[PDB]
């Protein structure tokens, strides 16, 4: 299904309008879902929310017809970044098989975090296997978007590099990896190998060499 974006400043109140409006008396469910994780039923009956969910998550009861179903998130924090689904049931329409669209809430105004680059040389057991791989691990950066640049000594290297797209951590920051593959001869025949990690407007370098 399609995804409709939404941006809310940090600490504000979010207003997520439901995808499909009800034609009659409704019963709307709200699920909080972050990709690669189990969804969390925020609100089951039009305004009933289960235990373990803060009072800042609220819905609209079905009092008089015409009121649209909207999920309200007061005091938005960086953890509120997820996909929110409007499971719309009503008297008129049939069985609500589809969960509907997906509101991609992105909380703005979060503090900028600098990466924590760490480069590892090829292991001995790997070199014993006639293969060699540099790994450049990046973590604790926000906003989650970086650029990796590999250099053999001073000359650039782009043949043999693989990079992960940033992924959100449990502390609401991001992390990515970079794997440069090279024959063990290329690892020895060069003086050093560097991994330049450019995040926002700054670059950070971690280098390694066979010594």
């Amino acid at each position: 299904s399609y995804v409709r974006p939404l941006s809310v400043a940090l600490g504000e109140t979010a207003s997520i309008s439901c995808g499909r409006q009800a034609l009659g008396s409704r019963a709307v469910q709200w699920y909080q879902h972050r990709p690669g994780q189990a969804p969390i039923l925020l609100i089951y009956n039009n305004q009933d929310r289960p235990s373990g969910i803060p009072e800042r998550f609220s819905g609209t009861p079905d009092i008089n017809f015409g009121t649209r179903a909207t999920l309200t998130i007061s005091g938005v924090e960086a953890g509120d970044e997820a996909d929110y689904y409007c499971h719309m049931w009503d008297s008129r329409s049939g069985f609500s098989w589809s969960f509907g669209g997906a509101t991609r809430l992105t909380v703005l105004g979060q503090p900028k975090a600098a990466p924590s680059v760490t480069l590892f040389p090829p292991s001995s057991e790997e070199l014993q296997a006639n293969k060699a791989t540099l790994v450049c691990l990046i973590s604790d950066f926000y906003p989650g978007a970086v650029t990796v640049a590999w250099k053999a000594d001073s000359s650039p290297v782009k043949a043999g590099v693989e990079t992960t797209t940033p992924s959100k951590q449990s502390n609401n920051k991001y992390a990515a990896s970079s794997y440069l593959s090279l024959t063990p001869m290329q690892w020895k025949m060069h003086k050093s190998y560097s991994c330049q990690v450019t995040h926002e407007g700054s670059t950070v370098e971690k280098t390694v060499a066979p010594t």
Partner: protein, 226 residues
């Protein structure tokens, strides 16, 4: 009090019957509703179907022609079967308990009501890949270190996702950072796990790296040292 745990093959050949199971812990199984939900890459949450407390089944018309949901009351295990799988069937299959809600708007006598279901407690998810490619166990290599220092455990060339990683058989839990995998052009994922430990702990707190790739039942271990 009630938790759910999925379990699947991880890899299923194209045009073959997928099969997953879901164990309920703490509560019974024949007194609640249970729903299968999957989430594909790029596509949103899709409701597969559900089964009642009386073990009555109702399938989503999107995949009604090839899904069979069951239940085993001897314990708390409910199963799912999906035949004629294609590449588009690869997703994270979740398992959740559906609660029946009776929304009444008019008179219950005339039938002016309707039933809505909602999943209140979910499982954790089972990754399932549909590919003609065969399974392969990973190859673990140590990453020796050099305020504090950091060591790692490289897990390269396995298929398919995922791979669980724990340090010291679950003892070391602080400062651990397991990174997402990398799908190389060869078609195999490559992972890397790293912990940040104090420098003085280098001699000689043994750091054992645990790696488990169930689609090949190839658990391995490896120690790191300068």
């Amino acid at each position: 009090q009630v938790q759910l745990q999925e379990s699947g093959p991880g890899l299923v050949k194209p045009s073959e019957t997928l099969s997953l199971t879901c164990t309920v812990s703490g509560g019974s199984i024949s007194n609640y509703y249970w729903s299968w939900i999957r989430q594909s890459p790029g596509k949103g949450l899709e409701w597969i179907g559900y089964i009642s407390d009386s073990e009555s089944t109702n399938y989503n018309p999107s995949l009604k022609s090839r899904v069979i949901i069951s239940v085993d009351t001897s314990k708390n295990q409910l199963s799912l079967k999906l035949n004629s799988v294609t590449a588009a069937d690869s997703a994270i299959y979740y398992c959740a308990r559906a609660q029946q809600g009776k929304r009444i708007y008019g008179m219950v006598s005339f039938g002016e009501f309707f039933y809505y279901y909602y999943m209140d407690v979910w499982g954790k998810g089972t990754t399932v890949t549909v590919s003609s490619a065969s399974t392969k166990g990973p190859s673990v290599f140590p990453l020796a270190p050099s305020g504090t220092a950091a060591l790692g455990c490289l897990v390269k060339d396995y298929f398919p996702e995922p791979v669980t990683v724990s340090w010291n058989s679950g003892a070391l839990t602080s400062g651990v950072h397991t990174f997402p995998a990398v799908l190389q052009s060869s078609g195999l994922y490559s992972l890397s796990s790293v912990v940040t430990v104090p420098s003085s702990s280098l001699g000689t707190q043994t750091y054992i790296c645990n790696v488990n790739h169930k689609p090949s039942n190839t658990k391995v271990d490896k120690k790191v040292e300068p």
